[PDB]
Design a protein around this nucleic acid. Structure first.
Ligand SMILES: Nc1ncnc2c1ncn2[C@@H]1O[C@H](COP(=O)(O)OP(=O)(O)OP(O)(O)=S)[C@@H](O)[C@H]1O
Ligand SMILES: Nc1ncnc2c1ncn2[C@@H]1O[C@H](COP(=O)(O)OP(=O)(O)OP(O)(O)=S)[C@@H](O)[C@H]1O
Ligand SMILES: [Mg+2]
Ligand SMILES: [Mg+2]
Lengths: 178, 318, 330, 257, 258
DNA sequence: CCCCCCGGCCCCCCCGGC
DNA sequence: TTTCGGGGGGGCCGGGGGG
């Protein structure tokens, strides 16, 4: 939206300390060639998105500390994404980045989307059971959509008749916290 | 003799979804997916020997047909599946250009996915997300909890249930008809009882009994298939009198060659799963069994220690 | 290694053919029938120490392939590395390739598989499944709880029982014929009793007894020789000690225990085991007596296993037996 | 095996071209038309752009019925190419809607033919339009000299600063352990023109670049004896290696002031 | 130091012979008799068999009173061998019922003496006589060409399929990133006979072999400039490299057709 | 004589029941 | 926190080969 050029990294790429130093480190204060050849005033600047930051393993060679150091002198916007903020591996990011929490979305905020999907896909969904589906997925919207896609292949009507079986079958067994 | 007879588990391995017994709703869903395509990322979980690998392979075959060789990448615990493999070979397969019909996709079958490391699973996330337009992933495992939550979120969950005795009997009858095996109802009942819902175990036991004795009846079946020792342990723990429990321990377990460590571990498991007994009593029995297990692990694995454990259990029960 | 006569008797009498394995008639017959008609499945041999599992599998391999069996089988045991990498490379290559010498099927013998890691066992699953057309696996174990359920699901199980008395008698007769030895019936009975179904113990004790005789040719092995070489209590000693404990007073019982032990330097643990065996057959009116006996004697055995004061342990045995038997009156 | 047939009379040329920019980009879209072959690739950091052009004059027999786009993983392509000798002819064959292409190594003197199949990749990278621009500085110097200077300076720091002023070229590196400098002036020799360092400066220039990108760029020095560097005030630097009937171009974005 | 005494004029010959198969097997039993030295070993996977024969003519001096078996570990022997120089003569010495073997490097011009001792190992691997077999195809080709083909195709896949048919030999590999195929034909040149490709065919053959085993086998190309491959549908492939007074043979079992 | 590829140690990080 | 042992992944070091 803000007219930036995205340089994205994830767990599918090597992000060790050596690769980080020889990789995105040079991109902190470097112009984007694509931005120059695609000429907004911010199109020439990078937005470094480090996704799945918790997916890198290693006390020092992993590069978590190196990323934390990078966060203190980056000359371009840097956005990190992780699933577990309180893990010990994330300690270096204590007070160096602006923390933004994404909470589990409530049923109401997504009832309209679920109804739109249900009618567009031409299968009937009861709005009174949607919350239950959310309870099955623990607020995982992707999981809810996958459940609808998989169930609708054979059962074209979703209501209280089969809500219990569907919820029990797709229950997300997440390990509890201490 | 240097010749081998093909095992019946392989010879009569189902080749189509319609030949798989049990879990009817899931099989029908897979059949519908094969007819219509658009197979999603899926995770199939369940107990050993119920037809998970068979189901995945049959689905892939029905989906791809002649293209199966090019469009299927199969990896299991016997192959290299490290983070480097995920980052290079799987990525290359996902990015590969392959012209397919207008409702089919390339398939990556990660069998025994519960053995994969956390790093490889994490690396698989964006690979699945970015290349879903042409590639789909099918995990097969025994414990779905070993699969990290992000991967579960990306896949459709299919939990396979245990096979009922009816389905095992049905498949065994088909195999017997196809093999012309002389049998008796009692022998088939014994085979089903010993299998405990394991189709592979049932078929292997049937083949071994036929090879070793010919006629499939209770005597031959039990000669080939020993009575499971967990049931003997349960009978020992449920005995009313200490003398009966000691008799069972000495005759059915100790004189048959079962090790003390095996006996104590089986006792712990059976006591854990003893619903007929009050939970507090079960906890006391577990305390005593754990004392005995520690003593055995230290090195004193004698019949006297097991007898003392039984005496303490009976004293608790009284 | 100059000759086979320099080997210990446990190894010098190792069976070389399936006809030299005793006490496992059912298993031997079944496996012989399997091999005869080419219907050998993946095998599991579960049993206690020294029952003939390794001997049986080696004899089966020799029968299948003949004298040149070592080069046509892949044998791995706890002394060799059997990590996941080994399964991935060496076992896979052996299972997926043809035989160098003949055109027959291939045999992999995982002796002492209960020491294998869980990762290697899991890796073995699809290896066993995929190459079952041309390859077969044999697993050997003493402890079944160390084997994953997936591996057990793919194997046909055979249990090796403790050796019956008749089989031990036949093997003893063969050994006596070969060694030109003489054994009395009482000595044979004592040897069988102390064997506890393990052939290696029988062979080792027989070798020691032969070494004990001044003239192995003319002299005969008597029960006295066995008790001396093994340093074990005689049945009469156990009977006397138990009778003194049950009937006599504390001073007399203590004196009798000390005298019996000092006569031949017997160990207290052997006396406890013998007394437990004797008391097993005793008919007790009250179950509480049995409970006390078992619990206290097990505690004493565990204490002895870690050392401690021997005299106090003997007095504890005496007191435990007396207190337990005091419950047979009321 | 009819639409695209492109023949190199030695297989060494294609291998050298691929090795010129193999270490900077991985997935490349080769667009082949009647005129020739072109390829535009963007590195992972999105700061270096590689543009390769090969004309029809560089082929013994080039034929292409209609334009075709081939997705190439450079690692696999190099692995395939290393199986061929220089004395042999290399023919690239591509058919309609190709899931793979054929590389044929043929030996004229012998009767040995080596046929390899390379699986193509699905690449959806956008094509960038490079409009002609009037650079304020244009220099040409032997490739070996530039490679040596870059390699020497990269040992000190990760950033190299290039200053162009009146009849003066300066390359400086400043790091933690220390710093280094190198100064050159335009020079022409009639006996050895191949070492004639030439500069054409309209306005003074001063630009900083990353060491790794320059080390990747200089790897193409083997393709051309000389190398041309074009620099503008606030535009990416252009490094050009000329071929017999083609070119290899590296557009490197500088560091912000 | 009298029972067995063998002399190599140059120590490089024995080093190269050992390096020819040091990466294939680890434990080897060398049997020395009055007619020379032989050795037979099987890799850990039991897929490859190495058979080495060295005749008396290869030695400047050779004496072996009675047959002697010496069990050796390859890495230790190679480590000892690499000490010697290329201009020093080598001498292998063993006594009656030895527990070790002595390697002596001599440099008469510099009067340099280097003595090394290697402890022997007890190996119960009896020499298995390889009964002669008739092969459907027998092809002799330069070692360099075969090594180049193996190295090129092994990159594409872990298995290499060799087909021999009428006046044609084909090496094929199929892998994840692509496939490769090399076709060669018989050819004889009188100007350069060393480069000739000789093929004798009785029945066509088609066998698949592991790439790693072929990579290990080609390491013997240094010993001989040519390699002879004998292939049959019912027998393992035989790769032979000829020495001055002996040979090195690799018997490789093909992969199961399934 | 110098540079690059690629096998092998060396180290460091993380489960360990069912 | 952590008393062995196994497995995996990443970093250098160095042998060998090629130009
Ligand atoms: N539902 C089934 N119907 C028919 N045969 C079955 C069925 N399940 C298992 N079998 C038989 O047992 C053999 C093995 O089945 P598998 O699909 O390998 O079980 P599995 O659950 O994948 O085993 P694990 O989890 O890897 S131990 C099949 O080839 C069939 O012959
Ligand atoms: N059934 C038997 N018949 C004859 N001798 C036996 C028999 N069982 C054991 N022995 C003897 O004891 C020795 C050891 O036998 P093994 O076959 O090694 O027993 P094992 O069951 O394999 O021992 P473990 O499980 O590794 S402790 C043999 O060499 C024989 O001399
Ligand atoms: Mg399975
Ligand atoms: Mg054994």
């Amino acid at each position: 939206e803000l007219g930036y050029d995205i340089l994205e990294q994830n767990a599918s790429d090597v992000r060790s300390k050596t690769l980080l130093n020889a990789g995105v480190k040079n991109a902190l204060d470097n112009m984007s060639v694509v931005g120059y050849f695609k000429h907004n005033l911010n199109g020439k600047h990078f937005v470094i998105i480090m996704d799945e930051v918790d997916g890198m393993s290693g006390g020092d060679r992993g590069g978590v500390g190196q990323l934390a150091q990078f966060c203190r002198k980056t000359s371009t916007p840097l956005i990190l994404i992780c699933n577990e903020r309180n893990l010990p591996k994330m300690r270096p990011f204590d007070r160096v980045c602006l923390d933004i929490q994404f909470r589990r979305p409530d049923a109401n905020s997504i009832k309209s989307r679920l109804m739109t999907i249900a009618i567009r896909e031409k299968f009937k969904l009861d709005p009174n059971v949607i919350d239950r589906l959310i309870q099955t997925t623990r607020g995982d919207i992707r999981q809810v959509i996958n459940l609808l896609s998989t169930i609708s292949t054979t059962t074209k009507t979703i209501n209280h008749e089969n809500i219990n079986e569907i919820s029990k079958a797709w229950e997300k067994n997440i390990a509890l916290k201490p | 003799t240097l010749s081998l007879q093909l095992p019946w588990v392989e010879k009569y391995r189902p080749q189509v979804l319609s030949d798989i017994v049990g879990n009817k709703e899931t099989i029908d869903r897979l059949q519908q997916i094969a007819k219509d395509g658009n197979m999603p990322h899926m995770i199939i979980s369940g107990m050993p020997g119920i037809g998970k690998t068979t189901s995945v392979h049959c689905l892939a075959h029905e989906l791809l047909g002649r293209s199966y060789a090019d469009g299927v990448l199969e990896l299991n615990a016997s192959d290299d599946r490290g983070i480097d493999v995920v980052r290079n070979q799987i990525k290359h397969f996902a990015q590969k250009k392959l012209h397919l019909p207008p409702g089919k996709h390339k398939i990556v079958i990660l069998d025994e996915a519960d053995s994969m490391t956390a790093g490889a699973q994490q690396a698989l996330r964006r690979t699945m997300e970015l290349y879903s337009n042409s590639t789909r992933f099918a995990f097969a495992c025994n414990q779905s909890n070993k699969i990290i939550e992000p991967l579960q979120s990306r896949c459709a969950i299919l939990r396979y249930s245990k096979l009922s005795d009816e389905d095992v009997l049905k498949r065994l009858l088909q195999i017997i008809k196809l093999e012309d095996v002389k049998y008796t109802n009692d022998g088939l009942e014994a085979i089903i009882f010993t299998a405990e819902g394991d189709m592979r175990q049932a078929i292997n036991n049937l083949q071994s009994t036929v090879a070793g004795h010919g006629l499939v009846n209770a005597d031959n079946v039990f000669k080939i298939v020993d009575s499971p020792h967990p049931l003997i342990v349960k009978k020992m723990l449920l005995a009313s009198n200490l003398e009966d429990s000691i008799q069972i321990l000495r005759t059915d377990l100790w004189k048959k060659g079962y090790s003390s460590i095996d006996i104590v571990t089986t006792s712990f498991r059976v006591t854990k799963n003893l619903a007929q007994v009050k939970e507090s009593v079960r906890l006391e029995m577990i305390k005593e069994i754990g004392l005995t297990h520690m003593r055995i692990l230290e090195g004193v694995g004698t019949y006297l220690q097991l007898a003392s454990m039984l005496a303490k259990i009976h004293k608790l029960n009284n | 290694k100059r000759s086979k006569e320099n080997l210990p008797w446990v190894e010098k009498y190792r069976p070389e053919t399936l006809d030299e394995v005793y006490g496992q008639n059912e298993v031997i017959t079944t496996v012989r029938k399997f091999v005869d008609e080419g219907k050998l499945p993946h095998l599991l041999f579960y049993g206690p120490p020294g029952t003939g599992k390794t001997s049986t599998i080696v004899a089966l391999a020799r029968e299948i392939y003949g004298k040149n069996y070592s080069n046509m089988v892949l044998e791995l045991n706890a002394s060799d590395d059997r990590g996941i990498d080994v399964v991935r490379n060496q076992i896979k290559d052996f299972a997926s390739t043809r035989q160098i010498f003949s055109k027959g099927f291939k045999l992999i013998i995982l002796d002492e598989a209960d020491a294998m890691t869980n990762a290697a066992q899991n890796a073995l699953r699809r290896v066993i499944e995929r190459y079952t057309k041309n390859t077969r696996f044999c697993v050997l174990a003493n402890y079944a709880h160390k084997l994953t359920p997936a591996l057990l699901s793919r194997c046909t199980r055979f249990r090796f029982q403790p050796l019956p008395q008749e089989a031990i008698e036949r093997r003893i007769a063969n050994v006596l014929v070969h060694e030109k030895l003489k054994l009395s019936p009482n000595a044979e009975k004592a040897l069988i009793e102390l064997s506890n179904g393990d052939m290696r113990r029988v062979l080792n004790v027989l070798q020691s007894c032969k070494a004990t005789l001044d003239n192995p040719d003319e002299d005969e092995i008597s029960d006295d020789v066995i008790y001396e070489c093994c340093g074990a209590p005689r049945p009469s000693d156990l009977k006397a000690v138990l009778k003194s404990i049950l009937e006599d007073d504390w001073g007399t019982a203590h004196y009798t225990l000390n005298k019996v032990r000092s006569a031949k330097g017997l160990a207290l643990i052997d006396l406890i085991e013998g007394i437990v065996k004797i008391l097993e057959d005793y008919e007790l009116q009250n179950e509480e007596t049995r409970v006390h006996l078992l619990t206290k004697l097990a505690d004493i055995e565990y204490s002895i296993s870690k050392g401690g004061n021997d005299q106090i342990q003997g007095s504890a045995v005496i007191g435990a037996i007396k207190a337990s038997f005091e419950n047979e009156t009321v | 095996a009819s639409m695209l047939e492109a023949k190199f009379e030695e297989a060494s040329l294609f291998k050298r071209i691929i090795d010129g920019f193999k270490d900077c980009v991985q997935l490349v879209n080769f667009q082949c038309k009647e005129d020739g072959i072109i390829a535009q690739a963007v590195d992972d950091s999105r700061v270096l752009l590689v543009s390769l052009e090969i004309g029809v004059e560089a082929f013994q027999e080039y034929r292409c019925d209609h334009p075709v786009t081939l997705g190439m993983d450079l690692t696999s392509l190099s692995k395939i190419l290393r199986c061929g000798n220089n004395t042999d002819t290399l023919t690239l064959i591509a058919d309609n809607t190709p899931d793979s292409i054929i590389l044929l190594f043929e030996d004229t003197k012998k009767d040995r033919i080596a046929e390899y199949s390379l699986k193509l990749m699905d690449i959806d990278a956008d094509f960038l339009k490079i409009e002609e621009l009037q650079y304020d500085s244009t220099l040409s110097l032997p490739s070996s000299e530039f490679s040596k200077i870059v390699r020497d300076l990269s040992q000190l720091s990760d950033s190299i600063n290039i200053m162009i002023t009146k009849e003066t070229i300066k390359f400086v590196a400043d790091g933690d352990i220390g710093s280094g400098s190198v100064i050159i002036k335009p020079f022409v020799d009639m006996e050895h023109p191949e070492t004639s360092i030439k500069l054409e400066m309209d306005q003074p220039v001063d630009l900083t670049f990353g060491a790794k990108y320059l080390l990747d760029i200089i790897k193409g020095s083997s393709l051309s004896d000389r190398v041309g560097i074009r620099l503008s005030s606030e535009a990416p630097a252009l490094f050009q290696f000329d071929l017999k009937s083609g070119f290899l171009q590296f557009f490197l974005a500088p560091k912000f002031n």
